[PDB]
Design a protein around this nucleic acid. Structure first.
Ligand SMILES: Nc1ncnc2c1ncn2[C@H]1C[C@H](O)[C@@H](COP(=O)(O)OP(=O)(O)OP(=O)(O)O)O1
Ligand SMILES: [Mg+2]
Ligand SMILES: [Mn+2]
Ligand SMILES: [Mn+2]
Length: 756
DNA sequence: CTGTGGCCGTGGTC
DNA sequence: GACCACGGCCAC
């Protein structure tokens, strides 16, 4: 299979490198003939003679048109003949494309900003990660000597651990007597030893957890101190550290550096993303955490270094195990998008969609629309109306069915052929007209995007069917992640229509999808209520919770299935309402905030403080215990004993202050904030103290006893000392616990005074 | 930075 | 005290 592609320049000429594994053998294929190009639409074919002669300059080098080729293509489905302009080197295109566009005989140019190596994969029809090829994988991690107040990587690496199917080992330069620890003389020999292990094992995949932003950068600094050529690349190269957005990403040429952290971070919803939390979440087994402060003391005092080596060995072991489970998912995504696993595992959803569309457009002889310039961008900054959210019938409900449309917006796009190339196109026999917004969409031929979402939805449903029929809970959980990723991807094609930077931007298409969605859900609500006597309790965008008041579970389920058959017979195309769940009880607080319990006893909470990262653990812990007492049982009086059990304690300072930390992210330069909340107030002080605050920084703070603004008496939890500080017990009662649980316990007649 | 809809505490205004 | 914008995170 194809692992990756890039290009190098030899004597001014580009050379594509295709990194392959075939029949167990790694190969580098070199392609010296593939040429960069872009397209030009001319006022008249004869003008190509002048365009051929346009030249530019590129760092002392004259840039010229190598050769030209007239080709027949389509733009948004409409045929048009253009000129394919070839060049010698990819960097020729940015140097000359403006001068060609400015030429009076050139109407417009296209596809002039496509990365050369990805252009190769598309135009050659190559798809990475295709084939029955078994890839050799190796995980690794490092333990370092950390002292606070030091620059990055000022201390040495103490241990390098690695794990594969044959086991896990640890390399260190102190004498630890464990069977899996290899002792060397120096930090230098340790690094050189690890380099040797990788070259000998020759793995196709190097698995890390956050290696993009810690492990490789640490190794780089230490190798620069020690004078080590850290030639992990299969071409003898060192790891290529490059900027990606607001952080970094690391390539190892010829291999796939699979950094699990970006994948895990967007696939699983967790309060924290330590390696320990991720391992237990996936496999349901604990992993002990040894902290940097313990590692340093063990190394300096030589005491209990076995525990550090075990922790390091376990880091590599669980990293390998996690990589085995998540590579297949990312490998499928690589095939769907048609780009390398390295790229798809790290790229934004917009790039995935666009790389996908550029390939499909090439397959269909469709010219890609250009990205917008600054002027067009400013024109695309309007919004549009979205989904319909019903105000809930707040309170406690029983025998509730949840009906929900399958892949609604993608199904709308498929059903009504919602595409920029079908919008208000004249001459067609048939049209679908969007409600409210009135946009018309030709139905005579499949639209570009509509013709592509079908296969994604097909693949997802196949996964979901396999999932539901999977015995192993771990495999099932991974399939759940898999189908959910395609769900989010498919829905991102809708959002792509309203994405200001999109090539195939179409805000009319976007607001037509949402308009149809609002029509379908409100029609379904009216239909289930008027024809089947249901009561709709709450609805959001494309699903609703409903019951028959007074009916038992058997009856509600039966009549729900009857409505589904009826409504699904009326719905066109790919629109289908699904039976998504039955719940014995359910409590709805506001829009987007409710909790339901199924017949097995599993509670599902949405939007409530229990699920929010920016609320105090004691407030979430309390609301959870409250809901459990209400839904799982029926003992409202028990709920009120837990809460008064918590107000008392907080009053007595018997609650661990660790349950009082508030986490809130900094999202911008501190100068750019208009309003200073508690987390910004703390952040501004830390920066004054020299701490360096960047967007993405999380502020973990606690509120101390006082009366002024919250931010005034808020400090980082790193500075909390119970000897000197008494937290604001009345804040965490009146502002964290009570407000969360009161909104629920209202319905049972309780007020805040009866909970304190 | 795929999209819109929404809650709610905070710290301002009057 | 009523009110509002901000800001963060969450449901679709
Ligand atoms: N991340 C998102 N980006 C864009 N639109 C979204 C996103 N999440 C939800 N939506 C929109 C499009 C969805 O069709 C619609 C209803 O959401 P939802 O029911 O969660 O998903 P779905 O209908 O696409 O999948 P499913 O088959 O699981 O119901 O809301
Ligand atoms: Mg839904
Ligand atoms: Mn659904
Ligand atoms: Mn749905």
């Amino acid at each position: 299979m194809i692992l990756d592609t890039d290009y190098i320049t030899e004597d001014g000429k580009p050379v594509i490198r295709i990194f392959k594994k075939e029949n167990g053998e790694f190969k580098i294929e070199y392609d010296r003939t593939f040429e960069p190009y872009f397209y030009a639409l001319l006022k008249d074919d004869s003008a190509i003679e002048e365009v051929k002669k346009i030249t530019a300059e590129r760092h002392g080098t004259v840039v010229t048109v190598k050769r030209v080729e007239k080709v027949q293509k389509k733009f948004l489905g409409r045929p048009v003949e253009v000129w394919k302009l070839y060049f010698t080197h990819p960097q020729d295109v940015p140097a000359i494309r403006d001068k060609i566009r400015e030429h009076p005989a050139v109407i417009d140019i296209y596809e002039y900003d496509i990365p050369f190596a990805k252009r190769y994969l598309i135009d050659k029809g190559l798809v990475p990660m295709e084939g029955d090829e078994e890839l050799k994988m190796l995980a690794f991690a490092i333990a370092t000597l950390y002292h606070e107040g030091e620059e990055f990587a000022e201390g040495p690496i103490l241990m390098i651990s690695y794990a594969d199917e044959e086991g896990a080992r640890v390399i260190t330069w102190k004498n630890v007597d464990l069977p899996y620890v290899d002792v060397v003389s120096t930090e230098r020999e340790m690094i050189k030893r690890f380099l040797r292990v990788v070259k000998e094992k020759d793995p196709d995949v190097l698995i890390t957890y956050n290696g993009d932003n810690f492990d490789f950068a640490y190794l780089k600094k230490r190798c620069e101190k020690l004078g080590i050529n850290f030639a992990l690349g299969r071409d003898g190269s060192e790891p290529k550290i490059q900027r990606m957005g607001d952080r970094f990403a690391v390539e190892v040429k010829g291999r796939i550096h699979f950094d699990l952290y970006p994948v895990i971070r967007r696939t699983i919803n967790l309060p924290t993303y330590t390696l320990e939390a991720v391992y237990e979440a996936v496999f349901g087994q604990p992993k002990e955490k040894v902290y940097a402060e313990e590692i340093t003391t063990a190394w300096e005092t030589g005491e209990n270094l076995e525990r550090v080596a075990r922790y390091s060995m376990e880091d590599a072991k669980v990293t390998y195990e996690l990589g085995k489970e998540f590579l297949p998912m990312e490998a499928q995504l690589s095939r769907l998008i048609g780009q390398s696993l390295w790229d798809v595992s790290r790229s934004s959803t917009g790039n995935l969609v666009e790389w996908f569309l550029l390939r499909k457009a090439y397959e269909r002889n469709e010219l890609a629309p250009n990205k917008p310039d600054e002027k067009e961008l400013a024109r695309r900054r309007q919004s549009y109306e979205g989904g319909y959210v019903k105000e809930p019938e707040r309170g406690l409900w029983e025998n509730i069915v949840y009906l929900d449309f399958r892949s609604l917006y993608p199904s709308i796009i498929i059903t009504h052929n919602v595409s920029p190339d079908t919008l208000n196109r004249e001459g067609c026999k048939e049209y679908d007209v969007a409600p409210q917004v009135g946009h018309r969409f030709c139905k005579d031929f499949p639209g570009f995007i509509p013709s592509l979402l079908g296969d994604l939805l097909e693949e997802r449903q196949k996964i979901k069917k396999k999932m539901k029929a999977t015995i192993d809970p771990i495999e099932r959980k991974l399939l759940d992640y898999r189908q959910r990723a395609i769900k989010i991807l498919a829905n991102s094609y809708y959002g792509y229509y309203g994405y200001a930077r999109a090539r195939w931007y179409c805000k009319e298409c976007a607001e037509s999808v949402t308009a149809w969605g609002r029509e379908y859900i409100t029609m379904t609500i009216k239909e289930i209520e008027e024809k089947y006597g249901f009561k709709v309790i709450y609805s959001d965008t494309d699903g609703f919770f409903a019951t028959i008041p007074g009916a038992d579970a058997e009856t509600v389920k039966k009549k729900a299935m009857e409505f589904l058959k009826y409504i699904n017979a009326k719905l066109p195309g790919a629109l289908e309402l699904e039976y998504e769940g039955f719940y014995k009880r359910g409590f709805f607080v506001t829009k987007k905030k409710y909790a339901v319990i199924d017949e097995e006893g599993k509670i599902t909470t949405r939007g409530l403080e229990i699920v929010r990262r920016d609320w105090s653990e004691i407030a979430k812990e309390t609301q959870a215990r409250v809901l459990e007492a209400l839904l799982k049982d029926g003992d409202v009086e028990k709920a009120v004993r837990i809460v008064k059990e918590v107000t008392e304690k907080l009053s007595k300072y018997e609650v661990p202050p660790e349950k009082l930390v508030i986490h809130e992210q900094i999202t911008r330069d501190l100068k750019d904030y208009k309003a200073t909340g508690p987390h910004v107030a703390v952040a501004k002080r830390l920066a004054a103290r020299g701490v360096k605050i960047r967007p993405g920084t999380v502020i973990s703070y606690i509120v101390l006893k006082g009366s002024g603004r919250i931010g005034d008496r808020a400090i980082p939890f790193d500075e909390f000392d119970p000897t000197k500080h008494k937290y604001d017990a009345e804040y965490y009662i009146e502002n964290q616990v009570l407000p969360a649980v009161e909104r629920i316990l209202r319905a049972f007649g309780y007020r805040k005074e009866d909970l304190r």
